[PDB]
Amino acid sequence: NNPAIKRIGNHITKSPEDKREYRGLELANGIKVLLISDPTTDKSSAALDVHIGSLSDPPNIAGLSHFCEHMLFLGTKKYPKENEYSQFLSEHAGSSNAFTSGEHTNYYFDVSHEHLEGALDRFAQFFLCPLFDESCKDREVNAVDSEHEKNVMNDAWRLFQLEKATGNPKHPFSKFGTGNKYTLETRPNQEGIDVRQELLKFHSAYYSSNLMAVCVLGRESLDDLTNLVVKLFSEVENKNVPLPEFPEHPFQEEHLKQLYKIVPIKDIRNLYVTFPIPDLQKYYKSNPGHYLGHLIGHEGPGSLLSELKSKGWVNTLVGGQKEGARGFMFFIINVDLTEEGLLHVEDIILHMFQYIQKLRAEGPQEWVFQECKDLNAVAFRFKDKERPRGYTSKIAGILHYYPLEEVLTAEYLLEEFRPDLIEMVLDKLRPENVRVAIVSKSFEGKTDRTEEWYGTQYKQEAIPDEVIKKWQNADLNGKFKLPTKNEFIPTNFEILPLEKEATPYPALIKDTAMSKLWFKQDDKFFLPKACLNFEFFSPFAYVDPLHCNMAYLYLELLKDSLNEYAYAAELAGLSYDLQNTIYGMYLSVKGYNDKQPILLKKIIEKMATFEIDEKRFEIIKEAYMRSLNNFRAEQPHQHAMYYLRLLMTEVAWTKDELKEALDDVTLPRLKAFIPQLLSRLHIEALLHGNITKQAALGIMQMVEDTLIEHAHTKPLLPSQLVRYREVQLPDRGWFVYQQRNEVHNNCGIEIYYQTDMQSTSENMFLELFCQIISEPCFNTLRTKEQLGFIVFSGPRRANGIQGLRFIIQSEKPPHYLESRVEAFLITMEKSIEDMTEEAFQKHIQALAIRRLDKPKKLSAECAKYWGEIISQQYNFDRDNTEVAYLKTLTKEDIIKFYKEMLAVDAPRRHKVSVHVLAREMDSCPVVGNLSQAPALPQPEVIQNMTEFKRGLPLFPLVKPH
Ligand SMILES: [Zn+2]
């Protein structure tokens, strides 16, 4: 009845909570398709996943599939303009990205719901007739080179590639997926290769309809979505490509029983333990690898981690199955390492094998399976509604692995108890199949090997056969017990009836010296979940570097202490977040509401009566020291942002000040700090979800009463509720602050054009301008000018003040970067003068959709309110208000705003620039086809942050709504 469709699927199993409608189908050309209809969605979305990636890169052109991914965005026969795609999305409230894994290339976008077809049509052409334009290729190669550059000095990426380097060199696993200028341009030139043709060959070879899945989400009916997907995708050609497979493991015989000693960039201490395993993917109905992951990676009483931590050897552990590709997987057990732990690796691994032996001795446990199965069933039933773009991306990828009818449920619902598989996998976790990697600065100078792509310094040794034996004879350790029943498993899921006096926004339901309580019963999502957000104010968390250190250590020690007990809550979908802030403390509790009161109470009770284990204090202090030091290894652009925070905020302690003050933190001194901190507080809370007003008032009073009882807490004076201000820059001023990054060989720059206080009008001026310049900026400064991978523009908001910021990471020096941004600003003004009245209105419309986009899930809506509360603006109806005003703005208003605040000769330009110089750059000046960059004034070089701040006014704070 339709030659274009091979088959429609049966019912797609969904959560009964889920109001969205679904249809699976397979096209005649073999594209597997999931259609999602949500007539309420603000943004629509599509994604396509090709089952080809890096593992299929030609051996002579490393990174070609990743390069292909970049290239697809840059013009097709039907839509030749390099930025037609991104520009269209931008003008219609959409966004887009893509990634390349070993076996996948995944492309996705969202757009205003009214413009699905326009978006999707442009999108489809990626997979039909890409141009791979000659000039785009030459340019885009730098973006990829830049992508790789930032990864070079990153410890995760180095370990990632090092593993691949130390397996079978013949195996596709050993390939370099990212690529760079060398692999994508330099080497290929030297070798007579036309990469444009190679891109064409590759696309044509592997971009076969038979290796593709597509997911589309929109307001349209399932039938309309069907016609649409047929109309645009049934013309993709079926080239019948065999799906690549890797049945032989990249780790063979001679790759096992190997030790690797590795030098990190950061001062980190890690042990990596790895076993080769078969592909467990097909066993998705039982997840035997996850069963063992769940047990070996447990953190409750009796667990592997518990003992390792008690012995003061490790702080954290990750265990479980790790993805490989079709035909191979890994099982891992990874831990960080204390100083002591570094000298006891052999015992740690013994304990690991002892725990595994316990699992053998006990045999597989149906009740453990049953518990996971139940938790997963609940998780799936009450899953939060996803944002469309993440969802379509995810589904496109998993359409390759499960029957149509099962795509939604397959990763959640367990069906089979499989003691056989559990033992089969367990039988592979043996010392004769082990790989051990130690990462420590102590191997500095003691290595004899260098990994090609990153330069990673390492050494390789056979593990002594006697050590293997010691591990093989590991017997039972009395310290290791399986976890017992999980008491935190929720059973009460009733959604409370919507109260008579319920409101659309949070209501101030308690206003006392001790606490401000904001409250909202959920009127949208109707899942049995809640958010309990608390802000504790104390001047003593940030009075000086010492106290800041102490606030941090206190809360880290608290969390470390609670970890065992809290682990079960987390498995049961009840988690918490607890950290020190520049104003005191922040506590959030979220998840199923049923057992929250229990977790919260244990938290507050513990913090009010805390007793510190000295062993733990020393270990945590030491890790915190390294943590601070390790900032020197963050990326230039991150340093840039850091220095701006420091320059523009009234009060801010530097990482240098914090670490210098850290040696003065003694056990006696901390014990004294805690009661001090807790003795006077103000609390501002937002309780939001499946809870009544009486429950909310009840919870708030419980928190207070616990503090009063155990810590004697009294209220804080209203005048002690100190918010910090932002530095007020002089009209027509320009400051430059300059530092060097000693790890990375790239530059970073942040340029901040401060405007004025936040307000309806000032907000929308800035925001409209950012909307208009957003993609032109990416297009000019990255795509055309290829300055770097990281090119960013948009609003800066802090302390109630705002402005325009640019952030770039580049191999080019900041003074050069600077003039290009300035050049760009002028382009934008002409551009704004040149654009139609409609083109203007389209941008108003796009920002309007962006701002009005409704949160899909409780925590997202909660987050919007929390922003209103923590900023002390309390403007819960901001979106409607600000959009109404947005629609009033004319082209002329924006031109004036720019001329008055932003232009190079603007009367009220307030400019700060942070230059972060590359490792290899000695000094560097602060000032200096392509568009015209204007002449700039001499900047005032900031010599000292304190003096700079002392010499300027401070802005007012914003007035509450
Ligand atoms: Zn990329």
From Swiss-Prot:
Query: Per the entry, what modulates this protein's activity?
Result: Activated by small peptides. Activated by ATP and GTP, and to a lesser extent by CTP, TTP and PPPi. Inhibited by bacitracin. In vitro modification of Cys residues impairs enzyme activity.
Q: Where is the active site?
A: E69 (proton acceptor)
Give a GO cellular-component term. peroxisomal matrix
Q: Which residues bind substrate?
A: H294, L295, I296, G297, H298, E299, G300, L317, V318, G319, G320, Q321
What positions does the record give for the motif labelled SlyX motif? Answer: 811-816
Which of UniProt's keywords are assigned here?
Allosteric enzyme, ATP-binding, Cell membrane, Cytoplasm, Host cell receptor for virus entry, Host-virus interaction, Hydrolase, Membrane, Metal-binding, Metalloprotease, Nucleotide-binding, Protease, Receptor, Secreted, Zinc
* Positions carrying N6-succinyllysine: K150, K655
Entry comment describing in which tissues the protein is expressed: Detected in brain and in cerebrospinal fluid (at protein level).
Cofactor details (free text): Binds 1 zinc ion per subunit.
Q: Where does this polypeptide localize?
A: Cytoplasm, Cytosol; Cell membrane; Secreted
Matching Gene3D superfamilies = Metalloenzyme, LuxS/M16 peptidase-like
Alphabetized InterPro entries for the sequence: Metalloenz_LuxS/M16, Pept_M16_N, Pept_M16_Zn_BS, Peptidase_M16, Peptidase_M16_C, Peptidase_M16_M, PqqF-like_C_4
Question: What kind of modification does the protein receive after translation?
Answer: The N-terminus is blocked.
Q: What is its main location?
A: cytoplasm
Q: Which family does it belong to?
A: Belongs to the peptidase M16 family.
Q: How does it assemble?
A: Homodimer. Can also form homotetramers.
What else is noted? ATP-binding induces a conformation change.
Q: What does this protein do?
A: Plays a role in the cellular breakdown of insulin, APP peptides, IAPP peptides, natriuretic peptides, glucagon, bradykinin, kallidin, and other peptides, and thereby plays a role in intercellular peptide signaling. Substrate binding induces important conformation changes, making it possible to bind and degrade larger substrates, such as insulin. Contributes to the regulation of peptide hormone signaling cascades and regulation of blood glucose homeostasis via its role in the degradation of insulin, glucagon and IAPP.
Q: What is known of its domains?
A: The SlyX motif may be involved in the non-conventional secretion of the protein.
UniProt-recorded name of the protein: Insulin-degrading enzyme
What organism does this protein naturally occur in?
Homo sapiens
